[PDB]
Design a protein around this ligand. Structure first.
Ligand code: FAD
Ligand code: 38C
Length: 448
C-alpha cells in the first residue's frame, strides 16, 4: 500500500525538523516513478532516500521536498554459503541480515553500535564498527549495488569496473548519487556466533594510547574502548578496552557446542531494573572502587555472545552527538583535543574510543587511520560555539567530522575536512545535473 504524506522529519538527535513528502511503498517500480516525476520538474526541490533514521543529523530529510522511506523494501533475495554473498534489498536492516545469515555460518562484515540501520544507510554513510582496523568500513564489502539515478535508470555498480567512480561516490555519498535499491554484500565466514575477548583497564590517556600503540592491536580483529572524558588529568582518558576475535567451535564451552551459531542476547535483565537507584556505594570513588573496576575489566580469553562483547544517556534538553577522527601520527594534538573537552565544562559520560585502520577510496568516506572519538554533550548554554571551536581544532589537526552524526557544522569547515569533496561533487554533477537528489544536509554543507 503506497502512501505519500507530509511528515515532520528529524534525525536521531531529534533536532532541526523539516516537513517533507514521505513516499512509503514496497513497490520498486513506484519508487522509480517518483524519481522520474521529480526529475521531470527539472529538479524541483528534490528527493532523498531514508532508511531507519538512525543518523543524528539532517542527511535523511528534505524540507519542502520528497523523502522516500526505503524500509518496506526489505527482501532478502538470496544467501550463498559457498560464495559468501547476500543479495538484499536496500531496506533490509543489519539485525535482520545477521539473524538470517547465521544459519549459513556468515557474519555481517561490518556492524555499527546499533543493529537498526538499513543496508542503504550502511552504504550511504560507509559505516564503521569495532573491526575497522582489520576489516575496513561497510563500503569495502559491497561487491555490487543497483543505483536508481536522476535519469530514472537503474545503474548496476561494482567496486572495480567502468562505473567504479560512481560506486565510490555512492559509498559515503549520503544518498546524493541516487537511491540504492539492491546490493550484493560479501560476508565474513564464521563457525560461531561468539567472541573470544580480552579486557584491559588503563589508568590514564597516556596509558590508553600506549596500549593501542604497542602492537597488540594487530592481534585482535575487533577493538574499542570506553574512556573517561570528565575526570581531570591524569585520570582523563583512562579506558575500559574491549578487544577480541570471532570464536571457533572448539573454543566454546561444551554446553555451547550444540548450538554454535545460535543467537541469545536477549533478557529483561537490565541494571536499571535490578538496581533502580544506582550501582554506587561507599567504595565506588575510592581506591577499592578503582581496584574493583581494574580487576573486573581485566580478563583473558572470555567467551562472549554478541551483546556482551558488542552491545553493552537521557536528558530533557536533548543531546549533541559529536564524532571525529584525528590522524594516527598527530597523537599530541589528539591528547590536546581531549584536554580541551574535559576543561570545557561540558560533560560526556558515553565515550567511544577506537583506533581506525587504513581508509578506502571513497572520497567522502569518514574513516581515516587514527584516533576515533564519539562524545555525548547534553545540550546547554555555550555548547554550539564550543563545538565550533572543536571543529576548528579537529580540522587543524587533519581530522574530520562524521556526517552520520553531524547536524550543526558549516559548509566551509566540512569542505576543508574533506579535501576530496570537489572530486566527489564533480561526480555528483555528472550523475545528477538537475539536483534531483537533495537533502537538508546537502544544502547546509553545500554538497547540492
Ligand atoms: C545508537 C546508534 C549507534 C550508532 N553506532 C554507529 C557505529 O558504531 N558506527 C557507525 O559508522 N555509525 C553508527 N551510527 C550511525 C548509523 O550507522 C548511520 O547513521 C546510518 O546511516 C544509519 O542507517 P539508517 O538506515 O538509519 O539510514 P538513515 O539514517 O535513514 O539515512 C542516513 C543516510 O543514508 C542515506 N540512505 C538511506 N537509505 C538509502 C538508500 N536506500 N539509498 C541511498 N541512500 C540511502 C540517506 O540519504 C541519508 O543520507 C549509530 C547510530 C545510532 C543511533
Ligand atoms: C544508551 O545506550 C547506548 C549505549 C551505547 C551506544 C553506543 N553507540 C555507538 N557506538 C559506536 C562505536 C564505534 C566504534 F566502536 F568505534 F566502532 C563508533 C561509533 C559509535 N557510535 C555510537 C553512537 O551512539 O552513535 C549507544 C546507545
Amino acid at each position: 500500500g503506497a502512501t505519500t504524506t507530509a511528515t515532520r522529519l528529524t534525525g536521531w538527535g531529534r533536532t532541526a525538523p523539516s516537513v517533507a513528502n514521505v513516499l512509503r511503498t514496497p513497490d520498486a517500480e513506484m519508487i522509480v516513478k517518483a524519481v522520474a516525476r521529480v526529475a521531470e520538474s527539472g529538479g524541483g526541490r528534490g528527493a532523498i532516500a531514508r532508511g531507519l533514521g538512525r543518523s543524528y543529523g539532517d542527511n535523511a530529510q528534505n524540507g519542502g521536498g520528497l523523502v522516500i522511506d526505503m524500509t518496506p523494501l526489505n527482501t532478502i533475495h538470496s544467501i550463498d554459503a559457498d560464495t559468501k554473498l547476500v543479495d538484499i534489498d536496500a531496506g533490509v536492516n543489519l539485525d535482520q541480515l545477521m539473524k538470517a545469515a547465521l544459519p549459513f555460518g556468515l557474519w555481517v562484515p561490518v556492524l555499527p553500535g546499533t543493529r537498526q540501520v538499513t543496508v542503504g544507510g550502511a552504504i550511504a554513510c560507509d559505516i564503521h564498527g569495532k573491526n575497522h582496523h582489520s576489516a575496513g568500513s561497510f563500503g569495502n564489502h559491497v561487491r555490487s549495488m543497483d543505483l536508481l539515478t536522476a535519469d530514472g535508470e537503474i545503474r548496476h555498480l561494482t567496486p572495480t569496473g567502468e562505473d567504479a567512480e560512481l560506486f565510490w561516490a555512492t559509498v559515503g555519498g549520503n544518498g546524493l548519487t541516487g537511491i540504492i535499491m539492491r546490493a550484493t554484500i560479501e560476508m565474513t565466514p564464521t563457525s560461531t556466533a561468539y567472541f573470544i575477548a580480552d579486557g584491559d583497564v588503563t589508568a590514564s590517556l597516556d596509558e590508553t594510547i600506549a596500549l593501542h600503540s604497542d602492537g597488540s592491536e594487530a592481534r585482535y580483529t575487533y577493538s574499542s574502548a570506553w574512556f573517561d572524558a570528565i575526570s581531570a588529568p591524569p585520570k582523563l582518558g583512562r579506558a575500559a578496552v574491549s578487544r577480541g576475535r570471532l570464536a571457533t567451535v572448539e573454543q566454546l564451552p561444551a554446553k555451547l557446542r550444540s548450538e554454535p551459531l545460535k543467537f541469545d542476547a536477549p533478557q529483561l535483565l537490565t541494571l536499571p531494573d535490578v538496581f533502580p537507584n544506582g550501582l554506587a556505594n561507599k567504595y565506588t570513588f575510592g581506591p577499592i572502587g578503582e581496584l574493583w573496576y581494574r580487576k573486573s575489566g581485566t580478563y583473558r580469553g572470555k567467551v562472549q555472545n554478541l551483546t556482551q562483547f558488542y552491545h553493552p544517556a537521557y536528558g530533557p534538553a536533548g543531546f549533541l552527538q559529536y564524532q571525529f577522527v584525528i590522524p594516527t601520527e598527530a597523537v599530541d594534538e589528539f591528547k590536546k583535543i581531549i584536554g580541551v573537552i574535559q576543561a570545557s565544562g561540558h560533560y560526556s559520560f558515553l565515550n567511544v574510543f577506537k583506533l581506525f585502520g587504513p581508509r578506502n577510496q571513497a572520497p567522502l568516506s569518514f574513516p581515516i587511520p587514527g584516533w576515533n572519538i564519539c562524545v555525548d554533550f547534553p545540550i546547554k548554554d555555550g555548547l554550539g560555539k564550543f563545538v565550533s571551536e572543536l571543529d576548528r581544532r579537529v580540522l587543524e589537526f587533519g581530522g574530520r567530522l562524521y556526517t552520520a552524526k553531524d547536524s550543526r557544522t558549516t559548509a566551509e569547515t566540512f569542505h576543508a575536512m574533506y579535501p576530496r569533496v570537489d572530486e566527489w561533487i564533480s561526480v555528483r554533477r555528472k550523475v545528477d545535473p538537475l539536483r534531483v537528489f537533495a537533502s537538508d544536509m546537502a544544502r547546509r554543507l553545500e554538497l547540492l
